């Protein structure tokens, strides 16, 4: 909104005209998720701790009694940096915002629930889900803004029906609960990410422009341009709550920050069309769920167990690998997934 | 060199113009580098380990090989040499500044840990030796040309032609760069995930100056064959990670002089080829503070005998005054990955 006052305002000061451009307000708008994560910082963890466990005060790397609700911070700085840098007349922004409010809801009734049930946020996720992909289909009638897209080929692009809401909804719920499952190490979650997110405001930019679009055969969505500010935005946020949640996390991410993460990843692939650039840019929270289902599926076939504990990370922290060492090489990982998914739009 | 290959296979083998493709051979390069850092780790280490020490606990100080640096160094070469072109001048003036620099940190390491000693201002000599070299041999290469402007962001108006200080401004800034790196090692991961943001942020900078349109669109000095440097700094943010594999807080190897005072000279030298050093400044922030810092309690210390800062370089201070090691490391992590970014917008506004 705050954008708004900038173009009402420019006819005093012809100045004011560059904040209506993507290059500048995505970077305003990723320095202001940051400052405000920082600011709402030591004090919100404080609060958070007294919440907790009453004493205020305070070995390290044996971390103990450290607050489980930070995700707050998130949800705080993405929702102010977006309505503060982003278009409200959007769609696609209102979109992405109750996904992530309504993720971010669900996964903090969650964690009081727990400091003072699965049947419950799952369907309170699904009907969610349901509900914005039946919205983006009525909107998408017949138009490329829904049909499926597939790296390697460009010829090949079969239009949606009902299948469009399936899908919608198995990545936005996949996606959010590997992100939930992936949260068993502290930081593991929130730079993957990051990475995820930078790949994402890059491919709705190149989304947003008539030559590009054309050029890299992408589907073209004429209010995708503004997903530039809310993943740049994520991107912010994420860095700013990465600076507490280090291996000597000071604050856990906790449900409420990740299934709120984890949906808005799902919904800016949904719908940039992208759901195979999602599973390979996020291939770490996929493998970790295929993790987690191999080792489920083993345990109950047989009585072997192919791995130490059913996530990857898990396992190799147990194995022997340090916590900062396997937290740090996942992000090489995801890293590298982001790279090759980013070329793989390119190769088409 | 696999380009010329192509070039000249491509009569029988239809379809390989995509090799010549700049996007595909850098990330296949960045893809090779990283593959080979991660294949040829763990001989590496066991070696060096059964050489510093003479043979083969959860964050024990001890049993970590100091010059693990041959890893990057080894895989940067190697991918340059295999997907860029070594006609071009450019980058066989980045590859040996960087095998310079490897090299005289490998005798440095060999002198102290093989030796167990404590080379001493010959390092500084050669140093200074081969960048003057190196900066008269591109000053001859360009004369009167963009080559030599200075760049100076947020004001494209002003563009200095250097003449003998161009000669200045390289020494200073490789030096400076290596040194910076140097300092900036102390801490295990700390001096090269910084490395892989620069390096990242310089190639999307030099493939941006390869096109005489997106040059002419970013007002920025279009160089010729400079293009093939995105492959010199790609590789190095493939090989810079590959080493981050083995160099996280748990560190299994460490990097001595050798490495870091290649990093730091590949950084100076780009910097000095696509005539960007003060946004070498802006993106390596991370490196000039941590020089600065030391400067600073230095010239305390000298003239008023009291410190401000616990320790020389800035992520000692920290870290000895209760944050944890990798809380410092990922905390500059950020930092460097921020100012990448500022860099990278302020060389649009012009």
Redesign the interface.
């Known amino acids: 909104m705050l954008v708004w006052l900038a173009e009402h305002l420019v006819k005093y000061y012809s100045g004011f005209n560059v904040f209506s451009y993507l290059?500048?307000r995505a970077?305003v708008s990723?320095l202001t998720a940051?400052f405000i994560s920082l600011w709402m910082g030591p004090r919100m963890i404080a609060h958070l701790q007294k919440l907790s466990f009453g004493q205020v005060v305070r070995s390290?790397?044996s971390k103990r009694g450290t607050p489980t609700m930070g995700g707050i911070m998130i949800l705080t700085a993405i929702v102010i940096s977006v309505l503060l840098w982003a278009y409200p007349s959007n769609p696609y922004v209102w979109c992405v915002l109750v996904v992530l409010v309504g993720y971010g809801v669900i996964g903090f009734v969650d964690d009081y629930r727990k400091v003072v049930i699965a049947r419950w946020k799952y369907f309170w996720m699904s009907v969610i889900a349901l509900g914005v992909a039946f919205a983006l289909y009525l909107a998408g009638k017949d138009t490329p803004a829904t049909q499926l897209v597939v790296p390697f080929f460009k010829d090949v692009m079969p239009q949606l029906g009902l299948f469009y809401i399936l899908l919608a909804y198995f990545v936005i719920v996949g996606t959010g609960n590997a992100v939930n499952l992936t949260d068993g190490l502290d930081?593991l979650a929130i730079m993957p990410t990051v990475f995820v997110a930078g790949g994402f405001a890059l491919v709705a930019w190149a989304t947003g422009n008539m030559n590009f679009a054309s050029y890299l055969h992408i589907p073209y969505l004429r209010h995708a341009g503004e997903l530039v500010i809310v993943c740049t935005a994520i991107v912010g946020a994420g860095?700013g709550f990465?600076?507490f949640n280090?291996?000597?996390a000071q604050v856990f991410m906790g449900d409420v920050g990740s299934l709120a993460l984890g949906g808005a990843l799902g919904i800016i692939a949904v719908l940039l069309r992208q759901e195979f650039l999602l599973v390979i840019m996020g291939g770490v929270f996929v493998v970790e769920t295929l993790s987690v289902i191999l080792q489920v599926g083993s345990f109950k076939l047989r009585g072997q167990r192919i791995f130490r504990m059913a996530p990857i990370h898990h396992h190799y922290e147990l194995k022997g690998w340090?916590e900062?060492?396997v937290?740090?090489?996942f992000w090489?990982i995801s890293?590298?997934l982001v790279?090759?998914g980013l070329?793989t739009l390119?190769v088409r």
């Open positions: 290059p500048f970077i990723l940051l390290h790397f930081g860095l990465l600076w280090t291996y000597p340090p900062p060492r937290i740090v090489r090489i890293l590298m790279l090759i070329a390119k």
